[PDB]
Amino acid sequence: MGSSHHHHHHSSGLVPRGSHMKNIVPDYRLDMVGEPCPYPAVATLEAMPQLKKGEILEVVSDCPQSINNIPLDARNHGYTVLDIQQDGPTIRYLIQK
Known part of the structure; x- marks a missing residue:
């Protein structure tokens, strides 16, 4: 049986953790100013259909x-x-799924 006569082509990245590798929950972040014109929250509405198995928002605007x-x-x-x-x-709002 081979011991060191094996050339690996891929790397083994096994990381046993209790949490997910990354975070795909935070949908969008609107930390500016509460504009009446449909421009900022435009992501919020578009997020509805693009919904996933975990959504979140963070809005920090002043009005x-x-x-x-x-x-x-x-x-x-x-x-x-x-x-x-x-x-x-100022005022800050947030949403989640």
């Missing part, structure tokens, strides 16, 4: 009003989880 821009989009088509939060001179 003088109280209405949520990005969340309003996903809420329209109706996603899985749509939540929001506020701090002070």
